[PDB]
Design a protein around this ligand. Structure first.
Ligand SMILES: *CC(=O)N1CCC[C@H]1c1cccc(CC(=O)Nc2cccc(Cl)c2)c1
Length: 186
């Protein structure tokens, strides 16, 4: 099946907890996969314009580890629950992808999660301005704009709204698209 095939592909790239104890400032992100209309999608958030860091930017759910978290996956799930109302029974964490080093002292660990079909996001408006889906296949043939660094523009066909996806968020989306969609019979 589509979902069993996606999980089997993802597991081959799992690094597990290999980098998880290193003494960094630690953040986790959840890369949330949603199956709709017979295709996989990624779920994105738009950060509230009120936030001090990166207001209005497209990002994955997640945030800073706190002492309550049993592990880095727990960080991602706790923060996703706060931000978009995703409950832990609604997400299956499949793997841990390559961590992202930034600022010399920070390590961001991405987890891919399969999201229940009955989940409906409840954006916390103090943190999240918007939530939207992009088909995973978009990231194989994105609409690229050069600002010199590459920005993706995705237009939702439901309403005509265009979102800019860039940086680490764009890079991780492409990675997941490659892992899941490369080398597949039609
Ligand atoms: C867009 C993005 O990936 N960002 C913006 C800030 C730096 C980077 C980032 C680093 C580490 C963790 C996260 C996850 C995150 O904080 N996500 C998130 C989304 C929407 C609202 C809130 Cl409060 C938080 C992002």
């Amino acid at each position: 099946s589509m979902l069993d095939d996606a999980k089997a592909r993802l597991r081959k790239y799992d690094i597990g907890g290999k980098y998880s104890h290193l003494p960094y400032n630690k953040y986790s992100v959840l890369l949330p996969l949603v199956a709709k209309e017979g295709k996989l999608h990624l779920l994105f958030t738009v950060r509230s314009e009120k936030l001090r860091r990166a207001p209005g930017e497209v990002c994955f759910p997640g945030g800073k580890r706190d002492p309550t978290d049993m592990d880095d996956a727990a960080t991602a799930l706790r923060e996703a629950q706060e931000e978009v109302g995703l409950r832990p029974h609604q997400v299956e964490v499949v793997c841990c992808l390559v961590p992202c080093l930034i600022d010399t002292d920070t390590l961001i660990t991405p987890f891919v999660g399969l999201i229940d079909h009955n989940f409906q996001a409840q954006p916390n408006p103090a943190e999240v301005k918007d939530v939207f889906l992009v088909p995973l296949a978009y990231f194989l043939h994105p609409q690229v704009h050069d600002q010199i660094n590459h920005i993706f523009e995705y237009t939702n066909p439901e309403d005509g709204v265009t979102y800019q996806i860039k940086g680490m968020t764009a890079n991780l989306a492409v990675l997941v698209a490659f892992i899941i969609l490369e080398k597949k019979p039609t």
